[PDB]
CSV table of C-alpha atoms and ligand atoms in Angstrom, one decimal:
chain,number,residue,atom,x,y,z
A,178,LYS,CA,34.5,39.0,43.6
A,179,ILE,CA,31.3,41.2,42.0
A,180,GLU,CA,29.4,43.6,44.7
A,181,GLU,CA,25.9,42.9,45.0
A,182,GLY,CA,23.8,45.7,45.2
A,183,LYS,CA,25.3,48.1,42.9
A,184,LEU,CA,25.8,48.1,39.3
A,185,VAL,CA,29.6,48.6,37.7
A,186,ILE,CA,29.3,49.9,34.0
A,187,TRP,CA,32.3,49.7,31.8
A,188,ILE,CA,32.5,51.5,28.5
A,189,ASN,CA,34.9,53.1,26.2
A,190,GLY,CA,36.5,56.7,27.1
A,191,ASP,CA,35.4,57.4,23.6
A,192,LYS,CA,32.0,57.5,25.0
A,193,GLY,CA,29.7,59.5,26.8
A,194,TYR,CA,30.5,57.8,30.0
A,195,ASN,CA,29.7,61.6,31.6
A,196,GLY,CA,26.0,61.0,30.3
A,197,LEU,CA,25.9,57.7,31.2
A,198,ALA,CA,27.0,58.4,34.5
A,199,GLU,CA,23.7,61.0,34.5
A,200,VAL,CA,21.4,58.3,33.3
A,201,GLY,CA,22.9,56.0,36.6
A,202,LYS,CA,22.1,58.8,38.9
A,203,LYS,CA,18.8,58.7,37.9
A,204,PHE,CA,19.0,55.1,38.4
A,205,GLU,CA,20.3,55.4,41.8
A,206,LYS,CA,17.9,58.5,43.2
A,207,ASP,CA,14.9,56.2,42.2
A,208,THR,CA,15.9,52.9,43.8
A,209,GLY,CA,18.6,53.8,46.0
A,210,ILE,CA,20.9,51.7,44.0
A,211,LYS,CA,24.7,53.3,42.9
A,212,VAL,CA,26.0,52.7,40.0
A,213,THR,CA,29.7,53.2,38.6
A,214,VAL,CA,30.5,53.9,35.1
A,215,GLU,CA,34.1,52.9,34.4
A,216,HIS,CA,36.5,53.3,31.6
A,217,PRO,CA,39.1,50.8,31.7
A,218,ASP,CA,42.2,50.6,29.0
A,219,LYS,CA,41.0,47.8,26.0
A,220,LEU,CA,38.8,46.7,28.7
A,221,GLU,CA,37.2,45.1,25.9
A,222,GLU,CA,40.5,42.3,26.3
A,223,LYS,CA,40.4,42.8,30.0
A,224,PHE,CA,36.3,41.9,30.1
A,225,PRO,CA,37.1,38.2,29.4
A,226,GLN,CA,39.8,37.4,31.5
A,227,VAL,CA,38.8,39.0,34.5
A,228,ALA,CA,35.0,37.5,33.4
A,229,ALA,CA,36.1,33.8,33.1
A,230,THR,CA,37.3,34.3,37.1
A,231,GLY,CA,34.2,35.4,38.1
A,232,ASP,CA,34.9,39.2,38.2
A,233,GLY,CA,34.6,42.1,36.0
A,234,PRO,CA,31.8,44.6,35.7
A,235,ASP,CA,28.0,43.7,36.0
A,236,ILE,CA,27.4,45.4,32.0
A,237,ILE,CA,30.1,45.7,29.2
A,238,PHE,CA,29.7,48.4,26.5
A,239,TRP,CA,31.6,47.4,23.3
A,240,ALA,CA,30.9,46.7,19.6
A,241,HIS,CA,28.8,43.9,19.1
A,242,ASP,CA,31.4,41.6,17.2
A,243,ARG,CA,33.5,41.0,20.2
A,244,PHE,CA,30.9,39.7,22.2
A,245,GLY,CA,30.6,36.5,19.7
A,246,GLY,CA,33.6,35.5,21.7
A,247,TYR,CA,32.6,36.6,25.0
A,248,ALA,CA,29.3,34.5,24.3
A,249,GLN,CA,31.4,31.6,23.1
A,250,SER,CA,33.2,31.4,26.4
A,251,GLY,CA,29.5,31.6,28.5
A,252,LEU,CA,30.4,35.5,29.7
A,253,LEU,CA,27.6,36.9,29.1
A,254,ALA,CA,24.1,36.3,30.4
A,255,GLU,CA,21.5,35.5,28.2
A,256,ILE,CA,19.1,38.8,28.3
A,257,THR,CA,15.1,38.7,28.5
A,258,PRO,CA,13.4,41.4,26.9
A,259,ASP,CA,9.8,40.9,26.0
A,260,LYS,CA,8.3,41.9,22.8
A,261,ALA,CA,6.7,45.5,23.4
A,262,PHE,CA,10.4,46.1,24.3
A,263,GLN,CA,12.1,44.5,21.3
A,264,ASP,CA,9.3,46.3,19.1
A,265,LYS,CA,11.1,49.4,20.4
A,266,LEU,CA,14.4,48.7,18.4
A,267,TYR,CA,15.2,48.5,14.8
A,268,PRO,CA,15.1,44.2,13.9
A,269,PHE,CA,18.2,44.1,12.4
A,270,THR,CA,20.1,45.8,15.6
A,271,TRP,CA,18.7,43.0,17.5
A,272,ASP,CA,20.0,40.4,14.9
A,273,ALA,CA,23.8,41.7,15.4
A,274,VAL,CA,23.6,40.6,19.5
A,275,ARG,CA,22.5,37.1,18.9
A,276,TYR,CA,24.6,34.5,19.7
A,277,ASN,CA,23.9,30.2,19.2
A,278,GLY,CA,20.5,31.9,18.3
A,279,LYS,CA,20.3,33.6,21.9
A,280,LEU,CA,20.3,37.5,22.4
A,281,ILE,CA,23.1,38.1,24.7
A,282,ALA,CA,23.2,42.0,24.7
A,283,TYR,CA,21.3,45.6,24.0
A,284,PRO,CA,21.6,47.1,21.1
A,285,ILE,CA,22.1,51.4,21.9
A,286,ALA,CA,24.3,52.9,18.7
A,287,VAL,CA,24.7,51.8,14.9
A,288,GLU,CA,27.9,53.0,13.2
A,289,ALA,CA,28.4,52.5,9.2
A,290,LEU,CA,29.8,54.4,6.4
A,291,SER,CA,28.3,57.1,4.3
A,292,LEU,CA,28.8,58.8,1.1
A,293,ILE,CA,30.5,62.5,2.4
A,294,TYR,CA,30.6,65.0,-0.6
A,295,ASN,CA,31.7,68.4,-0.8
A,296,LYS,CA,28.5,70.5,-1.3
A,297,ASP,CA,30.5,73.3,-3.0
A,298,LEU,CA,31.9,71.3,-5.5
A,299,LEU,CA,29.0,68.6,-6.3
A,300,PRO,CA,25.9,69.8,-4.8
A,301,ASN,CA,24.1,66.7,-6.4
A,302,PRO,CA,26.3,63.5,-5.6
A,303,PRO,CA,26.2,60.8,-8.0
A,304,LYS,CA,23.5,57.5,-7.2
A,305,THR,CA,25.7,55.0,-8.7
A,306,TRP,CA,29.2,54.0,-8.7
A,307,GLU,CA,29.3,53.6,-12.6
A,308,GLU,CA,29.0,57.7,-13.3
A,309,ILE,CA,31.5,58.3,-10.9
A,310,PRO,CA,34.5,57.7,-13.7
A,311,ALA,CA,32.4,60.4,-15.8
A,312,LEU,CA,32.7,62.5,-13.0
A,313,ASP,CA,36.2,62.6,-12.1
A,314,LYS,CA,37.8,63.4,-15.8
A,315,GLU,CA,34.7,66.7,-15.4
A,316,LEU,CA,36.2,67.0,-11.6
A,317,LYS,CA,40.2,66.6,-12.6
A,318,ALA,CA,39.6,69.0,-15.8
A,319,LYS,CA,39.7,71.9,-12.8
A,320,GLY,CA,42.2,69.6,-11.0
A,321,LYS,CA,40.1,68.1,-8.3
A,322,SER,CA,39.1,64.5,-8.2
A,323,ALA,CA,35.4,62.8,-7.7
A,324,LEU,CA,36.5,60.6,-4.7
A,325,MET,CA,39.2,59.5,-2.2
A,326,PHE,CA,38.6,57.1,0.5
A,327,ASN,CA,41.0,54.5,2.3
A,328,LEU,CA,41.6,51.5,0.1
A,329,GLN,CA,43.9,49.7,2.3
A,330,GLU,CA,41.4,47.8,4.6
A,331,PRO,CA,38.8,45.6,3.4
A,332,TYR,CA,36.4,47.5,5.8
A,333,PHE,CA,36.2,50.3,3.3
A,334,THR,CA,36.3,48.7,-0.2
A,335,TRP,CA,33.9,45.9,0.6
A,336,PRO,CA,30.8,48.0,0.7
A,337,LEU,CA,31.6,48.4,-3.4
A,338,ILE,CA,33.2,44.9,-3.2
A,339,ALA,CA,30.0,43.5,-1.8
A,340,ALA,CA,26.9,45.0,-3.4
A,341,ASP,CA,26.0,42.9,-6.3
A,342,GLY,CA,26.8,40.0,-4.1
A,343,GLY,CA,29.5,39.3,-1.9
A,344,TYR,CA,29.6,38.3,1.8
A,345,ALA,CA,31.6,37.6,4.6
A,346,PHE,CA,30.1,34.4,6.1
A,347,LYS,CA,26.4,33.5,5.2
A,348,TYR,CA,24.1,34.8,7.9
A,349,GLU,CA,21.0,32.0,8.6
A,350,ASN,CA,18.7,32.6,11.7
A,351,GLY,CA,20.8,34.4,14.2
A,352,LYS,CA,23.5,31.7,12.7
A,353,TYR,CA,26.8,32.3,10.7
A,354,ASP,CA,27.3,29.4,8.3
A,355,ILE,CA,31.4,29.4,8.6
A,356,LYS,CA,31.5,27.2,5.9
A,357,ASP,CA,30.0,29.4,3.6
A,358,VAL,CA,32.0,32.4,3.1
A,359,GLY,CA,31.0,34.4,-0.3
A,360,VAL,CA,34.5,36.0,-1.1
A,361,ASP,CA,35.4,34.9,-4.7
A,362,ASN,CA,31.3,34.7,-5.9
A,363,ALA,CA,30.6,36.5,-9.1
A,364,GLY,CA,29.2,39.2,-7.1
A,365,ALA,CA,32.5,40.0,-5.0
A,366,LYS,CA,34.7,39.8,-8.7
A,367,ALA,CA,32.2,42.6,-10.4
A,368,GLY,CA,32.9,44.7,-7.1
A,369,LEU,CA,36.5,44.1,-6.9
A,370,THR,CA,36.8,44.4,-10.7
A,371,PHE,CA,35.1,47.9,-10.9
A,372,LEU,CA,37.4,49.0,-8.2
A,373,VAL,CA,40.8,47.8,-9.8
A,374,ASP,CA,39.7,49.5,-13.1
A,375,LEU,CA,39.6,52.9,-11.2
A,376,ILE,CA,42.6,52.4,-10.1
A,377,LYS,CA,44.1,51.3,-12.8
A,378,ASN,CA,42.3,53.9,-14.8
A,379,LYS,CA,44.0,56.2,-12.3
A,380,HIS,CA,40.4,57.7,-10.8
A,381,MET,CA,42.1,56.4,-7.9
A,382,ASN,CA,45.7,55.8,-6.5
A,383,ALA,CA,46.2,52.3,-5.2
A,384,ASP,CA,48.4,54.2,-2.4
A,385,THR,CA,45.8,55.9,-0.8
A,386,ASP,CA,45.0,55.4,2.5
A,387,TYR,CA,42.8,56.8,5.1
A,388,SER,CA,45.0,60.0,6.4
A,389,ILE,CA,45.5,60.8,2.7
A,390,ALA,CA,41.6,60.5,2.1
A,391,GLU,CA,41.1,62.3,5.1
A,392,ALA,CA,43.4,65.1,4.2
A,393,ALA,CA,42.6,65.5,0.6
A,394,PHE,CA,38.9,65.9,1.5
A,395,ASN,CA,39.2,68.4,4.1
A,396,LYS,CA,41.3,70.2,2.4
A,397,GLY,CA,38.8,70.1,-0.7
A,398,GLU,CA,40.8,68.3,-3.1
A,399,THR,CA,38.2,66.0,-3.6
A,400,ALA,CA,34.3,66.1,-3.9
A,401,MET,CA,34.2,62.8,-2.1
A,402,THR,CA,35.5,60.7,0.6
A,403,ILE,CA,33.6,57.6,2.1
A,404,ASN,CA,34.0,57.5,6.1
A,405,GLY,CA,31.8,57.5,9.0
A,406,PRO,CA,30.2,59.4,12.0
A,407,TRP,CA,33.8,59.4,13.8
A,408,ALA,CA,35.4,61.6,10.9
A,409,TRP,CA,32.4,64.1,11.2
A,410,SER,CA,34.1,66.1,13.6
A,411,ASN,CA,37.2,66.2,11.5
A,412,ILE,CA,34.9,68.2,8.9
A,413,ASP,CA,33.4,70.8,10.9
A,414,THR,CA,36.7,72.0,11.9
A,415,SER,CA,37.6,71.7,8.2
A,416,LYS,CA,34.8,74.2,7.3
A,417,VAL,CA,34.1,72.2,4.2
A,418,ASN,CA,30.4,72.8,3.5
A,419,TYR,CA,29.9,68.6,3.1
A,420,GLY,CA,26.9,66.5,3.3
A,421,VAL,CA,26.8,62.8,4.0
A,422,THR,CA,24.2,60.6,2.3
A,423,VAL,CA,23.8,57.1,0.9
A,424,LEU,CA,26.3,55.6,-0.7
A,425,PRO,CA,26.2,54.9,-4.3
A,426,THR,CA,24.4,51.6,-6.2
A,427,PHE,CA,26.2,49.4,-7.8
A,428,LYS,CA,24.7,47.6,-10.5
A,429,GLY,CA,21.8,48.9,-9.3
A,430,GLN,CA,22.1,47.8,-5.4
A,431,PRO,CA,23.0,49.6,-2.6
A,432,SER,CA,26.5,49.4,-1.4
A,433,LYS,CA,26.6,47.4,1.5
A,434,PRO,CA,28.6,48.8,4.4
A,435,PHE,CA,29.8,46.6,7.6
A,436,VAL,CA,27.3,47.4,10.7
A,437,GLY,CA,28.6,48.1,13.8
A,438,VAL,CA,26.2,47.9,16.6
A,439,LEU,CA,27.6,49.3,20.1
A,440,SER,CA,25.7,47.1,22.4
A,441,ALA,CA,25.7,46.7,26.4
A,442,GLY,CA,26.4,43.1,27.7
A,443,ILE,CA,25.4,42.0,31.6
A,444,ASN,CA,28.1,40.0,33.0
A,445,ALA,CA,27.1,35.6,33.1
A,446,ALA,CA,29.1,36.4,36.7
A,447,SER,CA,26.9,39.3,37.6
A,448,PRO,CA,24.7,39.1,41.0
A,449,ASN,CA,23.1,42.2,39.5
A,450,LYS,CA,21.1,40.5,36.4
A,451,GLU,CA,17.9,42.1,37.0
A,452,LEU,CA,19.4,45.5,38.1
A,453,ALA,CA,20.7,45.7,34.8
A,454,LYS,CA,18.0,44.8,32.8
A,455,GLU,CA,16.0,47.7,34.6
A,456,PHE,CA,19.2,49.8,34.0
A,457,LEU,CA,19.5,49.6,30.0
A,458,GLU,CA,15.6,48.7,29.3
A,459,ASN,CA,14.3,51.5,31.3
A,460,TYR,CA,16.9,54.1,31.9
A,461,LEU,CA,19.4,53.8,29.4
A,462,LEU,CA,16.9,52.8,26.3
A,463,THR,CA,14.7,55.8,26.6
A,464,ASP,CA,14.7,59.3,24.6
A,465,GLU,CA,16.1,60.5,27.9
A,466,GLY,CA,18.7,58.4,28.8
A,467,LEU,CA,20.5,58.1,25.4
A,468,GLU,CA,19.9,61.5,25.1
A,469,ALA,CA,22.3,61.9,28.3
A,470,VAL,CA,24.7,59.9,26.7
A,471,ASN,CA,24.4,61.4,23.6
A,472,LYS,CA,24.6,65.1,24.7
A,473,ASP,CA,28.2,64.3,26.3
A,474,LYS,CA,29.5,62.5,23.1
A,475,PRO,CA,27.7,62.1,19.9
A,476,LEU,CA,26.5,58.4,19.9
A,477,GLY,CA,25.4,58.5,15.6
A,478,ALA,CA,22.6,56.8,14.7
A,479,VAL,CA,20.5,54.8,17.6
A,480,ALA,CA,19.3,51.2,17.6
A,481,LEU,CA,16.4,52.9,19.7
A,482,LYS,CA,13.2,54.1,17.1
A,483,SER,CA,11.8,56.8,19.0
A,484,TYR,CA,15.0,58.5,19.3
A,485,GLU,CA,16.7,58.0,16.1
A,486,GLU,CA,13.7,59.3,14.5
A,487,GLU,CA,14.4,62.8,16.5
A,488,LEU,CA,18.3,62.3,16.0
A,489,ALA,CA,17.2,61.7,12.0
A,490,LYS,CA,16.1,65.5,11.5
A,491,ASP,CA,19.7,65.9,11.1
A,492,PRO,CA,20.5,63.9,8.0
A,493,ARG,CA,23.9,63.1,8.2
A,494,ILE,CA,22.4,60.6,11.0
A,495,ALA,CA,19.4,59.7,8.7
A,496,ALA,CA,22.1,58.9,6.2
A,497,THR,CA,24.1,56.8,8.3
A,498,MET,CA,21.0,54.8,9.4
A,499,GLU,CA,20.0,54.4,5.6
A,500,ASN,CA,23.6,53.0,4.7
A,501,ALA,CA,23.4,50.9,8.2
A,502,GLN,CA,19.7,49.2,6.6
A,503,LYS,CA,21.3,48.3,3.6
A,504,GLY,CA,24.4,47.2,5.2
A,505,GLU,CA,25.7,43.7,6.5
A,506,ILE,CA,25.8,43.5,10.2
A,507,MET,CA,29.3,42.6,11.0
A,508,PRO,CA,29.3,39.1,11.6
A,509,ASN,CA,30.4,38.0,15.6
A,510,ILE,CA,32.4,34.8,14.9
A,511,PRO,CA,36.2,34.7,15.6
A,512,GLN,CA,36.4,32.9,11.7
A,513,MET,CA,36.0,36.6,10.6
A,514,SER,CA,39.9,37.2,11.8
A,515,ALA,CA,40.4,34.7,8.7
A,516,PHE,CA,38.4,36.8,6.5
A,517,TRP,CA,39.9,39.9,7.5
A,518,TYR,CA,43.3,38.7,6.5
A,519,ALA,CA,42.5,37.0,3.3
A,520,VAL,CA,40.6,39.9,1.9
A,521,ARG,CA,42.9,42.7,3.0
A,522,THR,CA,45.7,40.5,1.4
A,523,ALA,CA,43.3,39.8,-1.9
A,524,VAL,CA,42.3,43.6,-2.7
A,525,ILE,CA,46.1,44.6,-2.1
A,526,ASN,CA,47.5,41.7,-4.9
A,527,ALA,CA,44.6,42.5,-7.0
A,528,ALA,CA,45.0,46.7,-6.9
A,529,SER,CA,48.7,46.4,-7.2
A,530,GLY,CA,48.6,44.2,-10.7
A,531,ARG,CA,50.3,41.1,-8.3
A,532,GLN,CA,47.2,39.0,-8.9
A,533,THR,CA,44.2,39.1,-11.2
A,534,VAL,CA,40.9,39.8,-9.4
A,535,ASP,CA,39.5,36.1,-10.2
A,536,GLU,CA,42.9,34.5,-8.4
A,537,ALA,CA,43.3,37.2,-5.9
A,538,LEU,CA,39.7,35.9,-4.6
A,539,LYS,CA,39.9,32.5,-5.3
A,540,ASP,CA,42.7,32.5,-2.7
A,541,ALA,CA,41.1,34.5,-0.2
A,542,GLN,CA,38.3,32.3,-0.2
A,543,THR,CA,40.0,29.4,0.3
A,544,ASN,CA,42.2,31.3,3.1
A,545,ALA,CA,39.2,32.4,4.5
A,546,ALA,CA,37.4,28.9,4.7
A,547,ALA,CA,40.0,27.0,5.4
A,548,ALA,CA,40.8,28.9,8.6
A,549,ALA,CA,37.2,28.6,9.3
A,550,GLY,CA,37.2,25.3,9.2
A,551,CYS,CA,38.7,24.4,12.2
A,552,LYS,CA,39.4,25.8,16.2
A,553,UNK,CA,41.9,25.2,18.3
A,554,UNK,CA,45.6,24.6,18.6
B,102,UNK,CA,48.6,27.0,21.5
B,103,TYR,CA,49.4,23.5,23.8
B,104,UNK,CA,45.8,22.7,24.3
B,105,UNK,CA,44.0,20.8,21.6
B,106,UNK,CA,40.0,21.1,20.9
B,107,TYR,CA,38.7,20.9,18.0
B,108,UNK,CA,35.8,23.8,18.8
C,255,LIG,C1,47.5,19.3,16.6
C,255,LIG,O1,47.1,20.0,16.0
C,255,LIG,C2,48.2,20.9,14.5
C,255,LIG,C3,46.7,22.1,13.8
C,255,LIG,O2,46.1,21.0,13.5
C,255,LIG,C4,48.8,20.3,14.2
C,255,LIG,O3,49.2,21.1,13.3
C,255,LIG,C5,49.7,18.8,14.9
C,255,LIG,O4,50.6,18.6,14.5
C,255,LIG,C6,48.4,18.7,15.2
C,255,LIG,N1,49.4,17.5,16.8
C,255,LIG,C7,48.9,16.5,17.1
C,255,LIG,O5,48.3,16.1,16.2
C,255,LIG,C8,49.2,15.5,18.4
C,255,LIG,C9,47.8,15.6,19.0
C,255,LIG,C10,47.8,15.4,20.4
C,255,LIG,C11,46.5,14.9,20.2
C,255,LIG,C12,45.8,16.7,20.2
C,255,LIG,C13,44.2,16.4,20.1
C,255,LIG,C14,43.6,16.1,21.9
C,255,LIG,C15,41.6,16.0,21.0
C,255,LIG,C16,43.8,17.2,23.0
C,256,NAG,C1,37.4,19.0,15.9
C,256,NAG,O1,36.8,19.9,15.1
C,256,NAG,C2,36.1,19.4,13.6
C,256,NAG,C3,35.3,20.3,13.2
C,256,NAG,O2,35.8,21.1,12.9
C,256,NAG,C4,35.5,17.6,13.9
C,256,NAG,O3,35.3,17.2,12.5
C,256,NAG,C5,36.3,17.0,14.9
C,256,NAG,O4,35.8,15.7,15.4
C,256,NAG,C6,36.6,17.7,15.8
C,256,NAG,N1,37.8,17.1,17.1
C,256,NAG,C7,37.2,16.9,18.3
C,256,NAG,C8,36.5,17.5,19.2
C,256,NAG,O5,38.3,16.0,19.0
C,257,MAN,C1,39.1,27.7,22.0
C,257,MAN,O1,38.4,29.0,22.6
C,257,MAN,C2,37.4,28.5,23.6
C,257,MAN,C3,36.5,29.8,23.9
C,257,MAN,O2,35.9,29.2,25.1
C,257,MAN,C4,38.4,28.1,24.7
C,257,MAN,O3,37.5,28.0,25.8
C,257,MAN,C5,39.4,26.8,24.2
C,257,MAN,O4,40.2,26.6,25.3
C,257,MAN,C6,40.3,27.6,23.1
C,257,MAN,O5,40.6,28.8,23.6
C,258,CAC,C1,44.0,15.7,16.2
C,258,CAC,AS1,45.1,15.1,14.8
C,258,CAC,C2,46.2,16.0,13.2
C,258,CAC,O1,46.3,13.7,15.9
C,258,CAC,O2,43.5,13.6,14.0
C,259,CAC,C1,42.0,18.1,13.6
C,259,CAC,AS1,41.5,17.4,11.9
C,259,CAC,C2,39.9,16.8,11.9
C,259,CAC,O1,41.3,18.5,10.4
C,259,CAC,O2,42.7,15.9,11.9
C,260,ZN,ZN1,39.8,55.2,30.3
C,261,ZN,ZN1,35.3,45.3,16.1
C,262,ZN,ZN1,7.3,45.3,29.1
C,263,ZN,ZN1,37.8,55.4,-16.5
C,264,ZN,ZN1,24.5,27.6,4.6
C,265,ZN,ZN1,33.2,50.7,15.9
C,266,ZN,ZN1,15.4,65.7,27.2
C,267,ZN,ZN1,46.7,31.3,-6.9
C-alpha cells in the first residue's frame, strides 16, 4: 500500500513542515525522488492504526515517548546509522530513541523546561530553590511574587521532586525496569515536601495552573516562571524583558525536567527504508537541513551538535539544552500512564493537605508499580 | 479488553 520510489512523511502541523518540504525538494533535485510532507490531525494515533495493516507514511515525526508503543507493536524499522553519524548527535538523544536496546528513530530536536525570569525584577536569578522563599518575601514587599508555574501537572512539578533522587522508572542500559519505580524514595519526599511547604507557607498557591502562571509572568506580576520553548513567543509578545536560564538546584542538585526528543521514525512496512535513511541522515540531519526546518518554525534545541552550537548563541536555547542534559529523558514505555495518573493524584493530594507527603507518595508508588506490573485484558 | 495477554 506504501508507494515505492518516493517518500511520504508525517509531521505535526505545529512544526516547520514547509521547511521540511524544502529539504525534500533538495532531496528530489539530487535523486529525482519525490518527498511528500503531510501533517494529518492526530497523526500519532493514526500511524499505529494504518501501519499495522502495512500502510502509512515512510517516515513519522513525533516526540520519542510515543515511539516505544510503536516499537512494541513492531511498527518501526530499526535504524542503522554508523558510529561516525551517531557521533554527530548528543549521546543522550540516542538514549531517547532506543527500545529493547535497539535504535528505532533518529533524534531531531530537544525540549525541556527552563527557568524563565523577568530581567527587570530580577537581573540575578536564584541558583537554588532554597533561596526562593527569602526572595519571595522581598519581592512581595513590593507586591510582586518570586515564582509562579503550573502546579497541577507532574510534568511541571517533577523537576523539583526528582532533583534529590526521584524517578519514574529506572533506566538501565537502554531499557527501563518497569518494576523499579522511584516515586516514594527519600529524594522525592524531600522535593515534594519543599514544594508543599512553599504552598503551605503561601509562597505559591495550590491552585496555580498553566494559564494563571503564564498570565502572571507575561504581565510582570511574578519574577519567575517555569516553562518550555513553546511559551517564548507569548512572552516575546508581552514585551517583558525576560531571560531563560538553568533551573534552580535543590539540595545542591540540578532540577531534573523530563526531556522530549522530537524524533523521526521509519515505517517498518516502508519499501523505501534506504531512501529514508539517506534523507534523514544526509539531508535533514545537517546544518542546512535543520536550518530550513528551523526557519519555518523554530525547533528549539537540536540533537545535531554542529547546529546546536550555532543555535546556542541564543542563550535561551543554550539554557534549554543545559536543562535537558541535566534532566530525565521521558520513558517511552506504556507503563508511564500509571506513573502520570498516580503522581498527578499524589501531588494534588499533598499540596491540598488531603494527604501527607509520605502517604501520598507511598500510595502513588504502590499504584504506579502495580499498574506497571501487568499488561493485557 | 477482551483479548488476554500478558505482555
Ligand atoms: C482476566 O484478567 C483480568 C485482569 O487481571 C481479571 O480481572 C479477569 O478476572 C481475568 N479473566 C479471567 O481470568 C478469565 C481468563 C480466561 C483466560 C485469559 C488468559 C488467556 C491467556 C487468554
Ligand atoms: C502474564 O504476565 C506476567 C508478568 O507480567 C507473567 O508472570 C505471566 O506468566 C504472564 N502470563 C501469560 C503470558 O500467559
Ligand atoms: C497489548 O499490547 C500489544 C502491543 O503489541 C498488543 O499486540 C496486544 O494485543 C495488546 O493490545
Ligand atoms: C488469567 As487468570 C486471573 O485465570 O490466572
Ligand atoms: C495475570 As496474573 C499472573 O496476576 O494471575
Ligand atoms: Zn494538518
Ligand atoms: Zn508524549
Ligand atoms: Zn558514514
Ligand atoms: Zn517561607
Ligand atoms: Zn532494575
Ligand atoms: Zn513535546
Ligand atoms: Zn544556511
Ligand atoms: Zn494510603
